[PDB]
Design a protein around this ligand. Structure first.
Ligand SMILES: CCCCCCCCCCCCCCCCCC(=O)OC[C@H](COP(=O)([O-])OCC(O)COP(=O)([O-])OC[C@@H](COC(=O)CCCCCCCCCCCCCCCCC)OC(=O)CCCCCCCCCCCCCCCCC)OC(=O)CCCCCCCCCCCCCCCCC
Ligand SMILES: CCCCCCCCCCCCCCCCC[C@@H](O)O[C@H](CO[C@H](O)CCCCCCCCCCCCCCC)COP(=O)(O)OCC[N+](C)(C)C
Ligand SMILES: CCCCCCCC/C=C\CCCCCCCC(=O)OC[C@H](COP(=O)(O)OCCN)OC(=O)CCCCCCC/C=C\CCCCCCCC
Ligand SMILES: NC(=O)C1=CN([C@@H]2O[C@H](COP(=O)(O)OP(=O)(O)OC[C@H]3O[C@@H](n4cnc5c(N)ncnc54)[C@H](OP(=O)(O)O)[C@@H]3O)[C@@H](O)[C@H]2O)C=CC1
Ligand code: SF4
Ligand code: SF4
Ligand code: SF4
Ligand SMILES: [Zn+2]
Lengths: 176, 208, 297, 96, 56, 144, 115, 38, 156, 29, 379
């Protein structure tokens, strides 16, 4: 099925011609547009008062990355290198070796925030929920260097955001 | 065939096979092969000299009338003597169908331009020359369309490095943007993802 | 040799040249060229600045990530100098003001600050120090600028025996005062000048960094040909298509350029000096809206 | 258990610390070196060893689907204690 | 919205429609940001028998 | 009518603690709305809710006068909100931490830090691995 | 056999003629480009660079390769006529900002492992 | 219509590869060895 | 004594005037520009901060690089930067303009806009939300508030 | 045990959704 | 007859003017060429999926759907019905976002600029729907070659219904400000007229065809997902000018609202991705409790799934016209070739023909009515 958008033939009787002439001479449609704008002036604006008011978000939001850890205090990462292999932008660099007690742990875990595309593949490829994409988004920087995160920065982010990170994970893990 | 398997349509397959035989009968001088895929897609492999005739037929015959040129592209396969493969995709609105015409060429052999048949091909042809280096004869104006001015090489060839050969920066001594040999802070990590234990026996090749 | 400074790469932006250089006064006319030449080959640069960090922004895009570190300092405190040159293996001094100030006179700028820098660099284990003074610097010069330059040169030599003293002669360039000062007036025939191109001076400094035998030598960076003041000004005004700094600058320009044939120059560093005719048009094209001046040799 | 380098810096949990001669130390002047204070090895070494009365014990890290993949640990060796591959917790049979 | 009657009549006359019938600002009629847990039923190939992979 | 909105404005100016508090909130937040107080933060922030407003303005925060080490009377930013109140404020949940606090762990920070870019506390990246190749150490005894 | 399809030239004489015409065009255009783009080089330097770029491909003995190079040169000249480039594109031919790589064995041995 | 020229093919000057990456490189043509772990 | 006080107050007044009205010019190169147009949308309303919408490059104060910087475009961007008058600040938005991002290993992409022009604020994201860009703008305002030119000149 | 619970329209479906153009005439000859 | 270069989405335009008329108009592209088609060859199919969001960043889920359909056709699998309905529902929502953007940007370039804000409020609401489902406002990566990544949150359908029952008034206000305005009509009527034969030969698609009177629509002639199960009308123009295409876009917005209502009413239960763990990753609980699930998760997120060798051309009715992908697979886990056909390429190619004998100010209107986003044009 299809419709016609511009297939109307104007009437050619005296009344319609006079109406069109009156519209041309008195600018009725311009006044109608002015009235529409005036009506829109007198209603409440949609502006929010940033930074005192924040826009709504959801538990699935992707923001600044973080590295979580178990309740006992040991980091969840086991250097399986799945997140590095699945990263589309090759923004993750991982180096590992056996620890003092023989545990499989990383010696280097770097994420280049200027190469990352925030696609969330890393947090969904992780089998132990080690790397997560946190809910923070206000982490702008004055220099390029500070956007090259290393393991210490990501662990600090995890320790800093663990409360609401775990809350979001609890809220959303049934959809995954 | 459970709901995890894409359903198969046989009527469209038969119609496409019949039309492929019909086309190959009409133009035996140029068509070298005709194929119909398992998902009902008809493709025709022709000689390079038959680009202008065959296309014209598919655009003007009362039974074909493939009016629209959906896409025109090239594929690089370095293991072949004729390196580049030119692909034309045609859409027929009257019969609600699609066809594909494939041709071969190399670096030095030119291919007659089909601007006269389809005007839409014009920019597409330029794109090919920009990306692969295939020269199209009798083109209204053939020049680079996508790469930078003065760019050396055709990026879409398989032997062209991913990061190119030169990189741009700004120099204050000369107060302008200059090009230098490329040097990466981090080298692109190459992954050997391909694995042994072949997955599709239906595509197994003879052991020669 | 402290492996971290073993040269690596093909001498590009992301390579490692094994040079850790502290460029004092890098926010000036010569400092930008020196820092650019250092950074285009992968060397790490430490920039001590006393000005607003906004004014130093132009130095940011001349090095790779993390190769340029900006640090606050001032000449009146030795602790800032010590913390700035603590890890550097090369210290280049470009600090110098062409006029007096109620806080820094010529004696403070050219004598005490270079002396403190040289002494702190020697105490901190810096192996290479480069100090720049004027070519005409004489202890008996009528102007205080050159006497202070002369005193400063002696102080650096005393404090840092292995220092390299470079003596350019009225550097000219895109941002120099030598050409813009003469093109902004819109007396001569007995004074000769020997201008030197800015890129030549920067390359000479870089080669002095690389040259191992230039430890205690003193260099004189001069141009290829000499010009009388009058016809040089005539050429300057002709390039701009234009028809023809309180008290010290006029005296300094009114002095004739000295001749030091015993001192090695740019040719000893494998640099062919570029004549003023090639770059005069490039410098003076912005002063607009061919018959080069005669030289004396 | 964060230690201090002989120069004066803090040593990361991976043992990284620039020596006296390293020039890269200059990147920390007028700034700070980011170091995580909580060491995973020290935090996991102070966990008590669980005492179970079965030959084979199952571990999933706690939380079910929020932990690590479930693994089984054998406790026949009375010399030492079985250690989980992922979480690092320890298990032991009731000797004596 | 928290608008006086006279302003509401003015807007309705000027626009020509009933604004308060269909407002463009979201109010309490939206769903809550806290929701009960879901269940997400399994797919069709979750049988314990007659589920050989070579047939599907 | 007009008298009703004037009386509402008078109630708003009275409910901010008088004229001084009204002026302070006007010059600090550019908004003189009044709502029920949901909670107070350990850093001095206050969180208010008003369900009569449309989605987006029904929750807001008055920032603290002075945070850890800087005077935030005028310099405020969105990174000063602690994680629990950050989750509540962005409408990710309807339960403030006062009603149900987050789970407590020993490794969670007890002192939230705002963005420290352009500060002597800023993050400086560095390599975390150790030296790869060890060089030979020449002996200290002469051969002859 | 080894029979191939031509592009513009049947033999080497026609390809040489086309090369000559392209050289004439570039030689004529060099001073106009120098004046219009406000280059720091002289006309002599531009003509020398054109000569060097032409002689770089002097060992080609295939008419198809020669006239393909002629087509590329004509395209680049057309690019230069209509001021489609800028000063940087023109000046990329001189590498004024790149360090001069050495040629002898000892220098290459000193700088690095590059053969 | 056909040149019928007899000479080896050479497209060195059309690929745009820098001269130092043509006369200095040494390519290897081989059948990759089987990974001994599999 | 009084001179430092007077120059401090003059500097504070000038800094407030300069940071209370920032006029940006936006390079709508790629997808991130869409988010820029959402930070001009009614919900966020960049204008109420004094940040005008789509200022001309002649009178613009800050440049916002929004999207990938290709090799074919770098000269044009550099040229525009030279044209801007007085004190100009550059804000880099998105991974593509920060460090190349998703096209870092590309033959025709500049690996970060900082290779061409100096950058004052790096806004991370892909794309950064309108809130993130607004936070970057406010951070630039705070940075402008921090600078002191009259005091440095007086001590000079 | 627990029953399947996912996003579905409420029983009876949703209400009518207006999509036709509504351009009225204010009215004057 | 002077020549001028309108230099630096962003576009360079070299045109010759004989007084006020336009003689020749040549657009120079390549300013946003990043080489997506070459970077795709170095990534697996899942890794290459996010490139299509960057392709046409005004209509993202449509590009995702096109790529997913191509990969599904190569894989010989089909998604569950609920995934198809979500795809269709989201595709319609994305179409609204694209049409709002195009119409408002065209008006702003002309100089209206008020409907831009009026409808960007609704665009912000749509971003929220995109955000709730996938965690990203714009670059979603929600649609995967097996279906969709995740199921809908429990409160999404109600919010979509609440939003979509007030959008008709927004469209009516836009039409009130634009449709009958005499200035807008003078700016758009009889501008850039293209005949049906020329539009067909010049490779045009979408509204550019439908504006010229051609009755063609890929959702009707060649339905792909659940389209043959939803009823909607196809607006057809009568003159081929800018005004007819503007009216067609508005009517397409209304029909998109119709399809959204139908999709909301007829939502089926079931799973959201194909129950083939060799193509779609298993659930996290299954991965953490089952050995085969863990092996398949590992292999899918490290190596990927092997696609049988073959070449396909899959085209969909994206909001800007026919959007197609020619995918060539050699049997490995990485595509051998991925050519992208965007309607903007052909439209900008035909711009020179469509701007013959028009004023200089008419070129801006013609470019606006072409609905040109240079991400897909340059690729
Ligand atoms: C014009 C005469 C001034 C009165 C007026 O503007 O009221 C318009 C008022 C408009 O109603 P509204 O803005 O749609 O309702 C919003 C609620 O009152 C929302 O109520 P609220 O809680 O936001 O109250 C805010 C309150 C306090 O807010 C303020 O103090 C800021 C305004 C200061 C203005 C000086 O505003 C005032 O009390 C001052 C209003 C203007 C007085 C001048 O009604 C009229 O009196 C219309 C009269 C003729 C209009 C043609
Ligand atoms: C009559 C003669 C005229 C001569 C020239 C005068 C120029 C025009 C006169 C008008 C002067 C304007 C003064 C008003 C400035 C007050 C700004 C105040 O409101 O801001 C606060 C104060 O800011 C600064 O701390 C104070 C700067 C004001 C200058 C101090 C007094 C200097 C007066 C000296 C003038 C003498 C001139 C002599 C030579 C002409 C902090 O706000 P801010 O942080 O921004 O933004 C917060 C953002 N929030 C709200 C979202 C949280
Ligand atoms: C309705 C109200 C409208 C008001 C009308 C307009 C009134 C204008 C009022 C002017 C306010 C005061 C302006 C002072 C700021 C001057 C600009 C500035 O900050 O530049 C700093 C600049 C940086 O110099 P350097 O660091 O040494 O070199 C850097 C290059 N390498 O420092 C200076 O130049 C200082 C100049 C003298 C400042 C003291 C006098 C200021 C003017 C007083 C008012 C007189 C005019 C009225
Ligand atoms: N005509 C010429 O230019 C030739 C140069 N001379 C010598 O070459 C050296 C550099 O020349 P040039 O770059 O052109 O001079 P500039 O004036 O352009 O640069 C001077 C540099 O030194 C710094 N500086 C100046 N005074 C002080 C101070 N009191 N305390 C701290 N830092 C200070 C400046 O920092 P800031 O801007 O923040 O104040 C600035 O970075 C100088 O030593 C000069 O004497 C040699 C022959 C002539
Ligand atoms: S979000 Fe995507 S691009 Fe960023 S680190 Fe994770 S996998 Fe890599
Ligand atoms: S996927 Fe998780 S466990 Fe594996 S390396 Fe990455 S962060 Fe560590
Ligand atoms: S990938 Fe990110 S930075 Fe690049 S265009 Fe898309 S949103 Fe912008
Ligand atoms: Zn465990």
């Amino acid at each position: 099925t299809y419709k016609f958008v511009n297939m109307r033939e104007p009437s050619m009787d005296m009344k319609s011609v006079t109406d069109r002439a009156a519209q041309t001479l008195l600018w009725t449609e311009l006044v109608r547009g002015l009235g529409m704008t005036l009506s829109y002036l007198f209603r409440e604006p949609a502006t929010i008062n940033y930074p005192f008011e924040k826009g709504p978000l959801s538990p699935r939001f992707r923001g600044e990355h973080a590295l979580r850890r178990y309740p006992s205090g040991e980091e969840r990462c086991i250097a399986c290198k799945l997140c590095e292999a699945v990263c589309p932008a090759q923004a993750i660099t991982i180096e590992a070796e056996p620890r003092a007690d023989g545990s499989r742990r990383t010696t280097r875990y770097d994420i280049d925030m200027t190469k990352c595309i925030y696609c969330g593949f890393c947090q969904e490829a992780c089998p132990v929920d080690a790397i997560v994409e946190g809910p923070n988004f206000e982490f702008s920087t004055e220099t390029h260097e500070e956007l090259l995160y290393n393991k210490e920065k990501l662990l600090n982010n995890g320790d800093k955001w663990e409360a609401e990170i775990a809350a979001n994970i609890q809220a959303d893990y049934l959809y995954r | 065939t459970r709901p995890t398997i894409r359903p198969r349509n046989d009527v469209v397959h038969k119609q496409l096979s019949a039309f492929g035989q019909y086309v190959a009968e009409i133009l035996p001088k140029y068509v070298q092969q005709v194929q119909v895929s398992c998902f009902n897609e008809l493709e025709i492999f022709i000689h390079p000299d038959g680009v202008i005739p065959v296309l014209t037929f598919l655009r003007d015959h009362t039974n074909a009338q493939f009016k629209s040129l959906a896409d025109l592209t090239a594929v690089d396969v370095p293991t072949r003597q004729n390196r580049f493969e030119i692909v034309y995709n045609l859409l027929s609105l009257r019969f609600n169908s699609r066809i594909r015409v494939k041709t071969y060429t190399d670096e030095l052999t030119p291919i007659e331009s089909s601007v006269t048949v389809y005007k839409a091909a014009n920019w597409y042809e330029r794109e090919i020359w920009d990306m692969f280096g295939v020269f199209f004869a009798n083109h209204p104006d053939l020049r680079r369309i996508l790469t930078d001015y003065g760019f050396e090489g055709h990026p879409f060839r398989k032997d062209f490095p991913l990061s190119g050969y030169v990189e741009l920066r700004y120099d204050d001594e000369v107060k302008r943007v200059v090009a230098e040999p490329v040097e990466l802070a981090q080298e692109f990590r190459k992954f050997d993802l391909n694995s042994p234990w072949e997955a599709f026996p239906a595509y197994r090749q003879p052991p020669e | 040799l402290h492996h971290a400074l073993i040269p690596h790469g093909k001498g590009g932006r992301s390579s490692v040249s094994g040079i850790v250089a502290t460029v004092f006064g890098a926010t000036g006319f010569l400092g930008r060229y020196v820092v650019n030449h250092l950074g285009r080959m992968g060397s790490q640069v430490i920039v001590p600045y006393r000005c607003e960090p906004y004014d130093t922004m132009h130095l940011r895009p001349m090095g790779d990530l993390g190769q340029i570190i900006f640090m606050e300092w001032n000449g009146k405190d030795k602790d800032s100098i010590r913390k700035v040159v603590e890890h550097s293996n090369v210290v280049i001094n470009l600090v110098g003001r062409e006029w007096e100030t109620k806080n820094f006179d010529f004696e403070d700028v050219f004598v005490k600050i270079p002396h403190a820098i040289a002494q702190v660099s020697k105490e901190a284990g810096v192996e290479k120090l480069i100090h720049i003074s004027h070519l005409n610097a004489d202890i008996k010069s009528p102007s205080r600028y050159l006497r202070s330059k002369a005193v400063g040169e002696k102080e650096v030599r005393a404090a840092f025996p292995e220092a390299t003293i470079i003596k350019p002669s009225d550097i000219f360039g895109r941002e120099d005062r030598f050409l813009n000062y003469f093109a902004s007036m819109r007396l001569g025939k007995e004074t000769v000048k020997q201008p030197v191109y800015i890129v030549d001076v920067s390359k000479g400094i870089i080669n002095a960094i690389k040259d191992p035998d230039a430890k205690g030598k003193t260099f004189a960076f001069v141009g290829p040909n000499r010009y009388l003041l009058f016809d040089l000004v005539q050429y300057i005004f002709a390039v701009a298509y234009r028809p023809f700094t309180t008290r010290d600058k006029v005296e300094r320009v009114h002095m004739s350029d000295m001749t030091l044939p015993h001192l090695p120059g740019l040719e000893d560093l494998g640099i062919q000096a570029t004549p003023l005719e090639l770059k005069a048009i490039e410098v003076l094209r912005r002063h607009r809206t061919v018959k080069p001046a005669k030289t004396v040799n | 258990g964060v230690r201090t380098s002989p120069t004066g810096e803090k040593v990361t949990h991976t043992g990284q610390a620039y020596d006296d001669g390293d020039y890269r130390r200059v990147r920390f002047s007028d700034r700070q070196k980011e170091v995580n204070e909580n060491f995973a090895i020290d935090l996991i070494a102070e966990q008590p060893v669980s005492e179970v009365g079965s030959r084979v014990i199952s571990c999933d890290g706690g939380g079910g689907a929020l932990g690590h993949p479930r693994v089984y640990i054998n406790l026949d060796k009375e010399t030492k204690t079985g250690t989980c591959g992922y979480c690092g917790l320890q298990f032991r049979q009731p000797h004596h | 919205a928290s608008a006086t009657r006279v302003i509401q009549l003015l807007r309705n006359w000027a626009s020509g429609r009933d604004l308060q019938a269909k407002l463009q600002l979201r109010y309490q009629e939206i769903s809550k940001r806290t929701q009960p847990p879901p269940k997400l039923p399994v797919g069709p190939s979750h049988k314990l028998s007659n589920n050989y992979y070579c047939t599907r | 009518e007009l008298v009703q909105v004037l009386r509402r404005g008078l109630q708003q100016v009275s409910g901010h603690g008088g004229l001084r508090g009204y002026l302070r909130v006007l010059f600090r937040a550019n908004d003189v709305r009044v709502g029920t107080l949901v909670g107070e933060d350990k850093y001095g922030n206050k969180y208010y809710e008003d369900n009569k407003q449309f989605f987006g303005r029904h929750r807001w925060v008055i920032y603290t006068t002075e945070m850890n080490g800087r005077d935030t009377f005028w310099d405020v930013d969105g990174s000063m909100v602690p994680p629990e109140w950050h989750r509540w404020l962005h409408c990710m949940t309807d339960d403030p931490p006062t009603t149900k606090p987050p789970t407590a762990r020993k490794y969670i920070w007890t002192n939230h830090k705002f963005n420290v870019s352009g500060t002597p506390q800023q993050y400086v990246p560095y390599s975390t691995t150790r030296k790869k190749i060890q060089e030979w150490v020449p002996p200290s005894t002469p051969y002859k | 056999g080894t029979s191939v399809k031509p592009i513009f030239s049947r033999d080497m004489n026609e390809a040489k003629r086309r090369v000559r015409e392209l050289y004439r065009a570039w030689y004529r255009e060099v001073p106009n480009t120098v004046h219009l783009f406000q280059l720091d080089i002289s006309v002599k330097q531009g003509r020398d660079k054109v000569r060097e770029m032409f002689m770089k491909n002097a060992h080609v003995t295939d008419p198809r390769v020669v006239d393909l190079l002629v087509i590329k040169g004509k395209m680049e000249l057309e690019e230069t006529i209509n001021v489609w480039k800028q000063r940087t594109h023109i000046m990329r031919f001189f590498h004024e900002t790149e360090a001069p790589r050495p040629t002898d064995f000892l220098s290459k041995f000193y700088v690095g492992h590059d053969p | 219509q056909l040149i019928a020229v007899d000479e080896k093919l050479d497209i060195t000057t059309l690929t745009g590869v820098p001269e130092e990456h043509i006369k200095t490189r040494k390519v290897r043509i081989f059948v990759p060895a089987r990974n001994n772990m599999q | 004594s009084r001179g430092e006080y007077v120059v401090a107050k003059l500097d504070d007044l000038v800094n407030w005037a300069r940071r209370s009205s920032l006029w940006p010019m936006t390079f709508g190169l790629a997808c991130c520009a869409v988010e820029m147009m959402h930070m001009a949308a009614p919900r966020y309303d960049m204008d109420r901060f004094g940040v005008v919408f789509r200022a001309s490059p002649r009178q613009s104060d800050v440049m916002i690089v929004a999207g990938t910087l290709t090799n074919k475009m770098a000269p044009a961007l550099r040229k525009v930067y030279d044209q801007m008058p007085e004190p100009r600040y550059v804000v880099s938005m998105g991974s593509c303009a920060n460090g190349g991002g998703y096209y870092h290993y590309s033959y025709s992409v500049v690996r970060g806009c900082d290779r061409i022009v100096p950058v004052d604020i790096y806004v991370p994201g892909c794309p950064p939300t309108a809130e993130a860009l607004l936070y970057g703008i406010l951070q630039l305002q705070r940075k402008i508030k921090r600078e002191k030119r009259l005091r440095i000149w007086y001590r000079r | 045990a627990s029953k399947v619970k996912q996003d579905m329209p409420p029983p009876g479906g949703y209400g009518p959704i207006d999509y036709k153009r509504n351009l009225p005439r204010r009215g004057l000859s | 007859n002077l020549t001028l270069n309108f230099g630096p989405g962003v576009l360079r335009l070299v045109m010759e003017l004989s007084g006020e008329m336009v003689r020749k108009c040549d657009p120079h592209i390549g300013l946003l060429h990043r080489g997506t088609e070459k970077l795709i060859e170095y990534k697996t199919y899942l890794q290459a999926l996010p490139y299509f969001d960057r392709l046409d960043y005004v209509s993202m889920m449509c590009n995702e759907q096109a790529y997913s359909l191509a990969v599904e056709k190569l894989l010989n699998i089909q998604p569950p019905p609920r995934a198809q309905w979500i795809r269709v529902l989201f595709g319609e929502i994305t179409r609204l976002l694209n049409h709002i953007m195009a119409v408002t940007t065209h008006a702003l370039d002309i100089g209206a600029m008020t409907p831009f804000f009026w409808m960007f409020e609704e665009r912000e609401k749509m971003f929220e729907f995109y955000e709730r489902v996938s965690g990203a406002r714009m670059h979603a990566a929600y649609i995967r070659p097996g279906g969709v990544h995740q199921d809908l949150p429990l409160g999404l359908l109600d919010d979509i219904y609440e939003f979509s029952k007030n959008f008709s008034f927004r469209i009516d206000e836009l039409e009130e400000m634009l449709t009958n305005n005499r200035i807008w009509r003078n700016r758009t009527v009889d501008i850039g007229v293209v005949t049906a034969e020329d539009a067909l030969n010049y490779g045009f698609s979408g509204v550019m065809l439908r504006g010229s009177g051609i009755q063609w629509d890929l959702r009707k002639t060649q339905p792909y997902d659940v389209y043959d199960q939803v009823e909607f009308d196809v607006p057809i123009g009568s003159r081929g000018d800018c005004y007819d295409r503007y009216l067609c876009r508005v009517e397409e917005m209304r029909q998109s609202l119709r399809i959204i209502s139908q999709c909301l009413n007829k939502m089926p239960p079931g799973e959201i991705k194909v129950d083939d763990a060799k193509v779609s990753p298993p659930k996290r609980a299954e991965m953490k409790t089952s050995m085969e699930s863990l092996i398949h998760h590992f292999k899918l997120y490290t190596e990927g799934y092997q696609v049988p060798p073959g070449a396909t051309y899959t085209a969909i009715e994206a909001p800007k016209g026919e959007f197609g992908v020619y995918l060539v697979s050699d049997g490995s886990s990485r595509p051998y070739r991925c050519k992208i056909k965007a309607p903007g390429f052909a439209h900008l190619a035909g711009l020179d023909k469509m701007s013959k004998g028009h004023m200089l100010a008419d070129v801006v209107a013609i470019i606006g009515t072409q609905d040109i986003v240079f991400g897909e044009v340059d690729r």
